[PDB]
Amino acid sequence: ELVNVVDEKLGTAYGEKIDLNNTNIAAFIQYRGLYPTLAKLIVKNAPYESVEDVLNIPGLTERQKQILRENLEHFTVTEVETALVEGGDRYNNGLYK
Amino acid sequence: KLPEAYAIFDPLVDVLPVIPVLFLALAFVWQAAVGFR
């Protein structure tokens, strides 16, 4: 009844895709065209009901929409986990090299 | 770098700052010669 919610989140798609609702912003560097600019937008406009909501971020250039489309299969959304989004941890989670 | 007309003495200058040290070494050569009197 006492669960580590972070470990439990590694058993979800959070453990295999970039989770648009939870993943730190540094993960948007593993796919091209996404960092810093779209990463910044995705994070600020979170949370997302489903992966396809990213395309409804206002202000998107059609080039930006193309890159997001190109990468939707690398995204997921799970429920927001407080522990991963509090403390500005999506912008800086304590991990460098 | 030094002004060009002194270009010449560049390697003398790489050595000058150590000369004060030589004076301490020199005091021991003098005392060796006089028998540590």
């Binding site: 006492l2 580590n4 919610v5 972070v6 407080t82 522990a83 403390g87 941890d89 | -």
Partner: protein, 244 residues
């Protein structure tokens, strides 16, 4: 006229909110239409009260006073947010950003340290309906979030944590772990608090207001290690309003 850093530094006035002249008994009127922001909301606490635990049934222990031990580090400031007009004339302030948290530890009688995250994070505070003017009888009431005092990376003294750290008591390799689950599994608490803001001074010329606040919230639960205390915070506040 105002002061420079070098006048303030080391005095303790950096932890004090700006105050209003005792003459400032005005009113700031509200264009039902035009929009408004709070450009600066400052909350300075003056008193920390912790609820005791009464041990029996129908005694319900009291709010007892406490000694601060973390110094002039307590004030929330530079806060801002939307100030809306609802259909019925209630105003709602919606916090956006600011230095909206301070860790504090107060000491109860008998030595117990009680840490807490004095915060107004995500505050939404409303007025009664039919405002039309902010006056020296306007009250805001609202609620805010209180995240866990430590965030996820925090490592207890044995290296155990939630987003980092050991998942067991490594110094007790063959100990029975069920005794220790509460200490081994860290949990991230997220609770609500409540706050009243009582306007008592208004500069109708400048849009500045000031007064008193009381908030109630929970103390640190050390990532689930132990039960929290209830905390009541009293202090003073100041805010400036702008046509957005």
């Amino acid at each position: 006229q105002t002061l420079t850093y070098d006048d303030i530094v080391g005095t303790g006035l950096a932890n004090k909110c700006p105050t209003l002249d005792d003459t400032a008994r005005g009113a700031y009127p509200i264009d039902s239409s035009q929009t408004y922001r709070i450009a600066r909301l400052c909350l300075q606490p003056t008193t920390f009260l912790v609820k005791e635990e009464p041990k029996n049934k129908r005694q319900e222990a009291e709010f007892v006073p406490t000694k601060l031990v973390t110094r002039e580090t307590t004030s929330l400031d530079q806060i801002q947010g939307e100030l809306k007009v609802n259909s019925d004339g209630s105003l709602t302030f919606v916090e956006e950003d600011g230095i909206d948290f301070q860790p504090v530890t107060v000491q109860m009688a008998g030595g117990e340290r009680i840490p807490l995250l004095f915060t107004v994070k995500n505050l939404v505070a409303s007025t009664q309906p039919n405002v039309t003017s902010i006056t020296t009888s306007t009250d805001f009431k609202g609620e805010f979030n209180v995240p866990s005092y430590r965030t996820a990376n925090f490592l207890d003294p044995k290296g155990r944590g939630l987003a980092s750290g050991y998942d067991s008591a490594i110094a007790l390799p063959q100990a029975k772990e069920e005794e220790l689950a509460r200490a081994n599994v860290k949990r991230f608490s997220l609770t609500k608090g409540q706050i009243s803001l009582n306007v008592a001074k208004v500069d109708g010329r400048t849009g500045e207001i000031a007064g008193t606040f009381e908030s109630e919230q929970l103390s640190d639960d050390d990532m689930g290690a132990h039960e929290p205390h209830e905390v009541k915070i009293q202090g003073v506040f100041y805010a400036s309003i702008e046509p957005a």
